Amino acid sequence: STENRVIDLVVDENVPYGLLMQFMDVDDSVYPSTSKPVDLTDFSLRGSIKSSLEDGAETVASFTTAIVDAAQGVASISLPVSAVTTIASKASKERDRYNPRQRLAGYYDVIITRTAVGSAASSFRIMEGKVYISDGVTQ
Amino acid sequence: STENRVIDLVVDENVPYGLLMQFMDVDDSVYPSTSKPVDLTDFSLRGSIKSSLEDGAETVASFTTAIVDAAQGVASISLPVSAVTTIASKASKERDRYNPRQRLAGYYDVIITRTAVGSAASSFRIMEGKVYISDGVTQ
Amino acid sequence: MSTENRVIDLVVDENVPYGLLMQFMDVDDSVYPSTSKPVDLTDFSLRGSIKSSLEDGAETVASFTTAIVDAAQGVASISLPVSAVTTIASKASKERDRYNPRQRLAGYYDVIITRTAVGSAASSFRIMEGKVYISDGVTQ
Amino acid sequence: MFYSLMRESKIVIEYDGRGYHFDALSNYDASTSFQEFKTLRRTIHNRTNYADSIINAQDPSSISLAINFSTTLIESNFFDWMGFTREGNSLFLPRNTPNIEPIMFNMYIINHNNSCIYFENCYVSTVDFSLDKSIPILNVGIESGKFSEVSTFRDGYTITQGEVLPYSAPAVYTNSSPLPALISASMSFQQQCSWREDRNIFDINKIYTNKRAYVNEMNASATLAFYYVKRLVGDKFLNLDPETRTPLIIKNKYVSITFPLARISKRLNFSDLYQVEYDVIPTADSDPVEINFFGERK
Amino acid sequence: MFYSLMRESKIVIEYDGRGYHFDALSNYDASTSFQEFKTLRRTIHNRTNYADSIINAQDPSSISLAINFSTTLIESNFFDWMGFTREGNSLFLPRNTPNIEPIMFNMYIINHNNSCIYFENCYVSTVDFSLDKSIPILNVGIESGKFSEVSTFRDGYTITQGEVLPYSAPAVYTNSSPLPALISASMSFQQQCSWREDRNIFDINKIYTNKRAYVNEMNASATLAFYYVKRLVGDKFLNLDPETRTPLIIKNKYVSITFPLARISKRLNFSDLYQVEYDVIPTADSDPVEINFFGERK
Amino acid sequence: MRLPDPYTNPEYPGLGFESVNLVDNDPMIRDELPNGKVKEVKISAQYWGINISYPELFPDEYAFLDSRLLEYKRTGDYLDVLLPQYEAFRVRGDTKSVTIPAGQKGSQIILNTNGTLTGQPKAGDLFKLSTHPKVYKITNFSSSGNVWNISLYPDLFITTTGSEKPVFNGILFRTKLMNGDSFGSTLNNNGTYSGISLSLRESL
Amino acid sequence: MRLPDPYTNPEYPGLGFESVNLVDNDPMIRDELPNGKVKEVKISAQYWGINISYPELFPDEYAFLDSRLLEYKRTGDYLDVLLPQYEAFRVRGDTKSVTIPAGQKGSQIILNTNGTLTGQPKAGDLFKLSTHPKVYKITNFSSSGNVWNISLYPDLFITTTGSEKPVFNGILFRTKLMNGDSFGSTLNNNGTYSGISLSLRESL
Amino acid sequence: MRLPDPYTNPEYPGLGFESVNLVDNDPMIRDELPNGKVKEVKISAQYWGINISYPELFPDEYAFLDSRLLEYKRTGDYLDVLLPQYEAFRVRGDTKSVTIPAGQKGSQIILNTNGTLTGQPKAGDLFKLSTHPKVYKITNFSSSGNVWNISLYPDLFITTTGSEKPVFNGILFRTKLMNGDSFGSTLNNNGTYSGISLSLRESL
């Protein structure tokens, strides 16, 4: 368990990217952990892809948040193929050790937010990590 | 894409190549072996082969894609014998000391796409890896 | 198992006509174990050849005289006569195998089956490959 | 006469009618023996001194091979023969053991002058390799039922191991967060079969050889050794508490063993520099354990 | 990040609310671990491969310390905590074990950057030192019930071990007659306690730690090694016959273990130079075994 | 009277139940006809049998446990036994505004919760009425609005008078200690008491 | 009713037989004549006996299992079980269009598939008629085209009426519990119910 | 009907007899007088008892063995058991030209081999007549020319009619399976069947 916010995204060159997050609320009080999904009301997600963590870093791209099926908790984060091309343009020429197709493009993090659901701006970061562009061959 | 699911294709020289996929979604939570063949209606996959894994690479061949069975889930990726001959001509000559039949030709990817009215671009990458040519003598 | 499955080695014996008997059979294992049926080999022609090396310019030392003994039942046979065996033995490397001195390297080989038919399914597959070795003899 | 040198040998495994000559073999060890029934019939009439020993069975052989990783990935067939399901170049640990009996194959140990030892009814019972600061090598352990001496044999001229893969430093991740201060990642996979002895009264005055066996269990395991490192006071990520379920992957440039959900137990040693040791096994409901085999360029 | 070096550590024993920092520590060894309940539920329906393992208990820790003798004699508290009665600077072995449960104390193993490992519910189970031609050192062995990681701790700034005592040759006497040709006098004292496992169904889904223990026995023992020396033909003083009761004392310039009445068993080894070996235990009705601790000038 | 357990008395950890044995005792007259049909007849009542095992006990733990058991044998009270595995809190709220229609003598309780109770009971849980000491296990539960249909293993030992109130949490077994005719415990030379076992039977 | 098992409830893999003992129980009037000849007369009906042993059951799995068993004990119906070793689906197809000609008694049976079934039922497999709940065991098989001749170990309990349909898959034994009178479950300190076993017995 | 053994069915090596037990059952009324003389009385017949033990059985081996045993229990036939240790071929030739004089009802067979048989039977071998299923052991044998004097342990169960022909090789025990009233085999979680034992009795 503990914390696992750090996960790295590998986006594909020349292909639009879309991620599907099934938000969930597991509780291990009872031995079969409760599968209750969180209910997505007054929730907005924001995420930017910025090269390096230093202050003043240029914004490589910005995630486009989608909220669908609020009852069952799922949500989608995506960005158009034009955003993918803009990301791939500024990616470094050095390739990842384990995969000779990925190249480090920047860092990211998405931040959930409650906007005055109880007169509170309860915004906290969901996940984080590095964004990797995977060089394509089709185009 | 599927970075962990890279598979190297092997094409025989002097032989037309043929590879068939099966898009067949599963849900085994109800019971094991609950698999439903995905409808492939109005899906069009396409791909290419390039000599190097970078921009400006020379294209080697483009797979002659098809949809063998619509609504049955059996797609096919393939290319004719002349294209295989072109690949063999363009392939490198750094033959291995213990696999003297296989030479590297290039890198490949194929993208599935949805062209449905009332929908938008749904391009997604499903294959990734290298194309290896196996030498032949019987012509 | 990318190519490990369809590769076996042949050792033609010197001064003997070499004949290999093949039996095609469509074995079903994924659906259920122990289910196999022969392949209807009508219109499924065979052809093979042997060459000394894998380079672009290679010598055609021999060529199998393939024949379909049974149209149904998936039975075929690849064989070469005594003259071809003698040519292979003469045109073979003089370096002897250490673990079996009678065997010497002759060359490489492939087998392609061409199922040309009226139906537009004129597919071709490479069903065999490997190396060809010659086993020396004295009975002459 | 002809002596038999280990360095002048060739090990060919015969499966499905094809010879898998396993080159890049660092070292192998094997032995053959027979089982005896030696009873001493000391009686009040004659307190004898000479036993009644008859050789009636062949003791199963225990062959161990040490095989270097190769670019053609023939060595993954040992996982394939041991029971793992295959998709592409990745081997899955199935949720349930597929069949009752293991996958049986024959093995030859060739030597010069048509000398050979023929092990039959073999099965792969153990495969473990240590990802460390030395070149990785997987020690496979197979058990035979019948051994024999034969004149002609099967020699894998074509199916052979290529060049050994270059060394690459191991790294273990949780999702995508690296685990610091790795020392030695050792992975272990087993197919703990058992011989079914069916020696009966119809085999009297004959030599019996084991023929059939059944799989007691399959498992995937890994022991990870770290240095006790903490980044914060009262850290939550790095501590000694057990982890019921956590995604783990022991990754290399050419191989990556994946535990979709892992049960980790920690053990601290107060040595010269404090070392923690993990005990990683997949959970009850975890997805199949992955073993990817990347030849070159992933 | 922060690595943990054994040489950069400080061991503080917490008893009665006071910290006994045991300096002059030559070497210590410790380990922590957890107990698991791993069962594999293979059924005719599903011959599974994934075990059902849950961590439910902390395996008791076995900490061993090697402590040099010191001028302030803090190390005699280990005899004091292990159960010996005290009068002045001499420790008696009581005729009967005083209490059912041992004397429990906590122990810290401090390190830099507020890092610590907290062993709780400890008891001294073994103390043995060899009076020999090397510097004497007593290896104590304590067993813990619960181990933990804590941020702040107890550090014995004042209560500490002084300078190590200078070496002095051992000598064993009978009354006041010296025993010739001594080689190595090894003394051993134990408090052979046992953990009372009380893991019950109210501890399901929780980690259990041992808390209570009872003393099976206490004892004082010594093994003396001599060279087989005889002064007369048919000597009576020095021979191989057992001695039911004889007053013995293994004396040094800084310590003297006294057996008011001893049961000696002898063992002769026909080595390069013949060696006899004693096995000294106090008799049934012997007076309490003495252990004197002389700092300086007796 | 409550049997000492590490809920009320955690200072005596040796008083925990090392292993419980919930025995289903429902005597029946079973006859097997030669035509292959097995036939049963039930007359007597079903009583839950509880067997408790204990580890080695220190003098204070044994002193407390023995004092409680002797108090039981003196006043002739009823030992109450709590099983932790049956203490999952599902139904929460007030059980005083719920009504149980009278005249229910079968093996099934129909009650109108009146919307005052949150959650739903799960099959295999422990259920008990407020006016009778017998303990029931829920074998099935169907909820159609506010009216609940709880099915119980033992046939209802009482006919509902309309004043009974369902009890879902905090259920105790009104047991009576069997094997008390010859009850003892050996004290070893190391000071701990061994060989202590409680064979309890539900004396409703 | 149906006995829970991983096929009906895959979420409980602890259910499922660790070992099943399928005993044959044919009472017989055996007599050992003084001349060496052994004469045995079959009068009492034969019945399969099933002894099921369970692995370590966690509290929730045992709650489900004993809830189902107590529902069995309450409503008093029969308890069906499905042995998985005999679940090899060796006969595909739908058996409604398979006719069994009327007036057949004894071990032998003749049924006409009318070219519908695919797959041959080998000896040792189970067989059960649609109407009667008895479970037989195929001992020998012989087919001449579409017509199948099957020999069953227990003689046909009822003579075929021309409407009984073969059931080559999903055969359930209509059994009754034989451990009901005293059925206890022990809970360990590890948190699992150990040594849960059933002695079933086919009724009729 | 022949019991499956690795002579007829070597593809199932688990069907071999791990250990046979040839039991000599000859009930007698033995009385010991106070004068030290022990006296016996024999009325009932002697029957050879055979006990077979088996190792762990794979599904196919058990399927074959169970199919054969169920075929036996269905047709009510007689299991034939072959003991390999008694299959030493000494007497060879034709047993049709040999004549056995009639009227022999004792414990001794006098037969004129007519010079048609080579070799001589050894004491302790198995001997049987062609018209009766009882199996005899040769306790003594004296040959004076062509006439043989074979002595048998069980007293001749039939009076020779002059048409009987001696059988020396290929002798089978016409046994009937005892303990078939409660016959079963437990299937372990590893797929192998265990606990299979055949208690056979010679039902002539």
UniProtKB/Swiss-Prot annotation, chains A, B:
It comes from the Viruses. The keyword Amino-acid biosynthesis does not apply. Forms the collar, into which the side tail fiber protein pb1 is anchored. It comes from Escherichia phage T5 (Enterobacteria phage T5). Homododecamer. Interacts with baseplate tube protein p140. InterPro entries: LtfC/p132/Gp6_b-sand. One of its GO terms (cellular component) is virus tail, fiber. Keywords: Late protein, Viral tail fiber protein, Viral tail protein, Virion. It is found in: Virion. The keyword Thylakoid does not apply. This is Collar protein p132.
UniProtKB/Swiss-Prot annotation, chains D, E:
InterPro entries: Baseplate_tube_p140. It comes from the Viruses. GO terms for cellular component: virus tail. It is found in: Virion. Keywords: Late protein, Viral tail protein, Virion. Pfam families: Baseplate_Tube_p140. Forms the simplified baseplate, together with the p132 collar protein ring and the cone (DTP-pb9 and BHP-pb3). Homotrimer. Forms a pseudo-hexameric ring. Interacts with collar protein p132, DTP-pb9 and tail tube protein pb6. This is Baseplate tube protein p140.
From Swiss-Prot, chains F, G, H:
GO terms for cellular component: virus tail; virus tail, baseplate. Transmembrane segments: none annotated. Pfam families: DTP-pb9_A-dom_C, DTP-pb9_A-dom_N, DTP-pb9_B-dom. Coiled coil: none annotated. Keywords: Late protein, Viral tail protein, Virion. The keyword Lyase does not apply. It is found in: Virion. Homohexamer. Interacts with baseplate tube protein p140 and baseplate hub protein pb3. This is Distal tail protein pb9.
